Amino acid sequence: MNYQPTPEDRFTFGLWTVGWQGRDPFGDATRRALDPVESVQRLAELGAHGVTFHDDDLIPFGSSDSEREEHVKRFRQALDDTGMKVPMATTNLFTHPVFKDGGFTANDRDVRRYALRKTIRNIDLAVELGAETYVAWGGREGAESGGAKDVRDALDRMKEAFDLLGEYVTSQGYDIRFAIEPKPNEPRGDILLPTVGHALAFIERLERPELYGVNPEVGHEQMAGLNFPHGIAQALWAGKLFHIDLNGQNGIKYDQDLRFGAGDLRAAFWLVDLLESAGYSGPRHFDFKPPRTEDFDGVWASAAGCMRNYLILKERAAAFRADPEVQEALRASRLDELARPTAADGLQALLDDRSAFEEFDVDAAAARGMAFERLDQLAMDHLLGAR
Amino acid sequence: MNYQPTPEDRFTFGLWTVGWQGRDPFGDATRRALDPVESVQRLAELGAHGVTFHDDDLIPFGSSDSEREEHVKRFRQALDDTGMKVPMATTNLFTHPVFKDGGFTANDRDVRRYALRKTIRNIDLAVELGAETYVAWGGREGAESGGAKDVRDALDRMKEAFDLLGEYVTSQGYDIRFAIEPKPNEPRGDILLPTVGHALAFIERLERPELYGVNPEVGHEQMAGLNFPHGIAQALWAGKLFHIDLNGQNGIKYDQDLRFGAGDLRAAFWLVDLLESAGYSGPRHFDFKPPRTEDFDGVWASAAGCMRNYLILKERAAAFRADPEVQEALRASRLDELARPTAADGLQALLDDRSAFEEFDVDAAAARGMAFERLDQLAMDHLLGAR
Amino acid sequence: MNYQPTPEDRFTFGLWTVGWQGRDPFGDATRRALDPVESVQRLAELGAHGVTFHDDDLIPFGSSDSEREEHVKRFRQALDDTGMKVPMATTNLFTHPVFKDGGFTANDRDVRRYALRKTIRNIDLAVELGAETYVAWGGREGAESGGAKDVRDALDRMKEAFDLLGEYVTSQGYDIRFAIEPKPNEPRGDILLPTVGHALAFIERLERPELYGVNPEVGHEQMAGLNFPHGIAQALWAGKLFHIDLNGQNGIKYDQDLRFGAGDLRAAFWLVDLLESAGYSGPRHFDFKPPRTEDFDGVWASAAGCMRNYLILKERAAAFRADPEVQEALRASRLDELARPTAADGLQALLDDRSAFEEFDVDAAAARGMAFERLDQLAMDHLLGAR
Amino acid sequence: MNYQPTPEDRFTFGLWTVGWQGRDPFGDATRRALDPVESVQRLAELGAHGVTFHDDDLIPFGSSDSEREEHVKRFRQALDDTGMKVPMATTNLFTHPVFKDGGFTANDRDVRRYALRKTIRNIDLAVELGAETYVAWGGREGAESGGAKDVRDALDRMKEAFDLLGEYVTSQGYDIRFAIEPKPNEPRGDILLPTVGHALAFIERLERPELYGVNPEVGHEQMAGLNFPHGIAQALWAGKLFHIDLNGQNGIKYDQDLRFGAGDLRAAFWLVDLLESAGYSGPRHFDFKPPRTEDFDGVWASAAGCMRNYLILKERAAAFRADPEVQEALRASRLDELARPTAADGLQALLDDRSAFEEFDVDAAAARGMAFERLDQLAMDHLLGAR
Numbered sequence A, B, C, D: 001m002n003y004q005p006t007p008e009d010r011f012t013f014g015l016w017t018v019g020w021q022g023r024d025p026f027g028d029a030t031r032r033a034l035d036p037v038e039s040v041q042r043l044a045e046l047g048a049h050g051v052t053f054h055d056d057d058l059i060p061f062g063s064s065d066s067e068r069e070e071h072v073k074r075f076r077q078a079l080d081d082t083g084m085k086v087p088m089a090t091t092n093l094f095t096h097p098v099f100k101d102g103g104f105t106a107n108d109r110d111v112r113r114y115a116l117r118k119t120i121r122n123i124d125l126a127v128e129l130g131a132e133t134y135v136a137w138g139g140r141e142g143a144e145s146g147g148a149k150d151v152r153d154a155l156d157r158m159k160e161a162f163d164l165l166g167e168y169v170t171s172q173g174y175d176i177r178f179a180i181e182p183k184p185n186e187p188r189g190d191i192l193l194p195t196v197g198h199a200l201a202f203i204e205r206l207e208r209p210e211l212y213g214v215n216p217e218v219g220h221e222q223m224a225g226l227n228f229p230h231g232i233a234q235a236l237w238a239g240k241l242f243h244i245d246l247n248g249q250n251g252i253k254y255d256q257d258l259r260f261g262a263g264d265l266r267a268a269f270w271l272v273d274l275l276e277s278a279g280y281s282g283p284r285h286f287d288f289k290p291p292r293t294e295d296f297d298g299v300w301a302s303a304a305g306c307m308r309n310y311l312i313l314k315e316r317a318a319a320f321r322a323d324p325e326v327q328e329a330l331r332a333s334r335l336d337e338l339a340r341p342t343a344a345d346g347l348q349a350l351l352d353d354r355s356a357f358e359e360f361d362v363d364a365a366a367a368r369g370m371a372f373e374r375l376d377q378l379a380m381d382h383l384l385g386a387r
Ligand SMILES: O=C1O[C@H]([C@@H](O)CO)C(O)=C1O
Pocket: A016, A090, A135, A137, A181, A217, A245, A287, D026
């Protein structure tokens, strides 16, 4: 009973994940910098399908066009040598001091123009390398104090930025879509579009909404105490789950980025159940950081457990839904009725139906147990292999 | 220096607020039930503009049509006697045991039909009494366990319910709009549409989106650790702030419903600054519970402090925005630049502008301080009257 | 592979747990009241070892001495008929309106005297029924506002109450110890002694500290975002784990009281690992509420899953510690070194040791990986039975 | 109406506070390094009374004894030139990679010995510079995973470390006491002794408890959602408030370290009320970070607002307690009764008192309102200067 990934499982990793040197707000790096081409090689040996990058992960900030082309050629050779893909790319609009008040919603106009130019340059590279999804994480968009940011004005600037990006892509004829990644706080005191629902709502006000979806992250919704599978279900319902970031988080605190399966393990089970049963077909991307306690052996051990835990949870969720006793429990709890229209007979028929009100026996209905606890222990037994 | 409300301040209260008997999960009622007509009279004397109700606050669950008409006539006489209005009404789809798995997203279809019939009956009454806004708080819509609720199916049923309600209103020719009230948890382990952003996103998938907005509550967004003024700004930006619930909350815990001004007092300041500067013109509604430590004198003291605190914060926010030294600080922090388009010159001009990238001096831009801390201490001095 | 409890597993339940009628802050009871003697019989059939009670669970508030003796005789017959024990008892100082500002720290002195008299009466009964532990949960001790409670004065009154209780027990010659149960909030805005550490610290100021320990509850420490196994380890380290309350909680929100194993499942694993490896020998008590969605079949299903989940986690934790590959990983991560004295050679030798400072190679030490991620995935594989 | 600090207000600042360069988990430094002697001069001009330091703030890690003595002489000249004091010192056991698994509870024994030697060297310097308090913040003591740290063994090592430090001080005849600073998480997934109560409890197991107290930090207790004034009251009650760290925090998230008065402003009011009315006479120390949005002008503006906000809150708290109408409200709410013994008449008299039970009228007692809401609005009016 082993759980070996192959490139057909669509597992991806950011360069910055296994590449995290372990600098935290209170401590220096505990690991040396990794060459991108070493990370590509090591991830291919563990069974990954591809990698993702920020511009500045791949090409050092301030690189000349000569150095740029060098970095890209070495990278491209490692992808050719391994068969690794690049399904997603993104921009670093958070590290450089110039971004201290944001990129697209910086109060200084010149900064906002610079943010857009830096982004557009990396969309061209992403397209060259074959990415299908371009992620936007506005980690510097927000405030520590109420007077620093008019949020209506800041949403105007955010909408303006994404519309220009949408204009750019369509004018170039690129086949790339955008995915906005919410986060509620950190590094800003509050971040704009802090959850999946705020990002989905914002998208509906862009000039071309069909170009934009969400990239939700496990630990980011959990930093607001929200149910991550529920938010994914709403993203799926809206047709906007373009990409996903998988990791673990222990409750409401700083962003831990633990390997996938750590943190809330039952949430991880229900997440995998939903992605698999909804037939999500995008990358299974890990946005995680190996703890700074670890050396490079612990780095690759952590990246491998990401994939392992996904595959174990996939097996247990599938055994759960395939169990006849579970299918019977689901009927007992009326999940079949949840899927039926309330009033396909229409409004007037509803209004005329005395069994819906005048003659509805509310005490008999109230008395029916939902049988959720038996259902939930079957799920528990399946997760633990006690079934 | 006093702070006396008048009906022109548009302060409203639910019957269930000053009427809360003080039953909590661990204790019996500490106060006797109030007659609605007593509450109408006492709130009119304190300077309120109107009251709101759930169906079951006004007419006891299971009332005959004869008793119903009696309750309504007494109520209507008290409104005539006081000049109090009824700007908003809502449905109780949470107290009765029949609603233990929800109203509109109950797994049992018969329950969902009953929920819609109970709602429609109260929309007719609300219209009769002159309400302009109908609130929907789906406090029983959600789950304690992952297998109990398919959330895609449950959003389908939620959409179906709100579309039928929209069909009903338009067929009757009623001038009433709907406001969805988010809450993240309690009494369900997780509640569907848990924040303002999730409710805004959902609305965009209804058949007639222009009929629906949000009713955000201070303490409910704060139960997810979110910035309430930021979520209101996004609701204002979308044109969907139909109504608002004002109260106080101390952080991430059970729903406290403290009087307005308690809880996060700086958030309350920034909220009032925003409602007043955006020119919000709906009711200022208090959804609060006087602590069960209190007798009826403490009830009316608490309701009065709601209004007082709003008026004190209104004065301090206005003095803040009117202060020349503040207007100068706002320019120092480039709030004026935040309000200017990033690229009114358009995409091609942006692309051709060397000052936006090739010749942008990122170190000079990085070095400019934002001066937010001086701005925030001016706001502090204004709030405390130390200015 | 089944997991059947016997009375030798020391599983206990409060009468109020399976007896919870499902009244919540927003809804009426969904279940009828259970007779205590029915609950005793049903729990004995599921394999429990005993039950616990508040005074008012067993004897209705205001009962005459004639009714009191009746209730107790019926109860005692059910225990004789089933072989069920009563290892713990406690007082209801939270439900009655008289306790709205607390019992032992109520501002009204007369109330505080009444609280002590009500407590002492139930200690005599507890002793009669054989309880070894008397729990104190001061759920009404605290405040919603800062001026309502001087906390120094309130700790003085709390200390006074517990000292008098300690005087009472020793004067009667009773073999009973006290266990204080912390909770951070709910139903009060803040509760005094809000965590395990605050309760442990308080105990050290009582006149007879050896009479008092803690009764920690899973969901209560998790309501402050704390690591429950870490707090139990500190209680074990102090010698003060007199009793424990087992249940589940999903993060920082209202007190859910889900069955044990729900909530944070990895915390539950590490908790069972610690109780079993430290050789805790008190009751395994479930303080949980079957969700109000359930009928009586779902009640007994939920109580049974409490016990099942404990036994599954016991097996997986034992397999984890017994695995040679785990024992090797533990050495790799230097858990053996953590258990050795830092400086058994004493202070002067430490000071004279050049290898501890002058000649300590800090870069070689820094470079050693901790290998925690491989250890943690072995724990994961063991929990999931993927091992 | 201004609020000018003098050195008699006992305001202190860490070198690392105004010296924070603005490196966060996601971004580079936004400010250049400050010379300690510049910070001493600038803080003296703003009215501070003294500064505090980590060893590595003052003397660069790895400094030769020649460089060490140089750094110290320059520092000492700036203190002589300004009249600034050094009331507290501490050790950096968190930045260097060698401390990635802790200092005193590192799994590697050699590291733990090195941590103690590094500490002892800085106690000698602290004594030389006149510090009265030595702070210990074990920010690296804890774990991201359950198998990485046996917490009983780790408390044994923590106790061993503090006992050796206590032995050292007493053998040298130094007049210095220790203050343990709790934090619940960050940078470790969970930190040992995570709150004030856990630190107080631990102290009671040291060989010489009278040498040790707590250094609580505003934002650290609030990261667990705890009431900071309540935890200070318990520290005061135990006689263990040796030192305090003042700052602001917006709820349960990463450690913000905002200037004092930001964050929870009503908690700040109640904190100042308590320190002033209990007559706390230690330093008023600011452990804060000027946001990385700021230049050096915004640094000194932020440090100045720390002090200003303390002085404004001091004035409002004093006006609150001095108001006759408040003193009357306090009696109305029976705060005077809270301060009286419950049973100075003793146990036997309590037992014989029929007015405490047999003849206690529980309904009359229940019916008395606490009048807390009127009290709390008077506090509100005083804080806002609306009084
Ligand atoms: O682009 C991203 O950056 C952050 C972070 O991973 C960098 O540490 C994250 O959440 C992304 O998806």
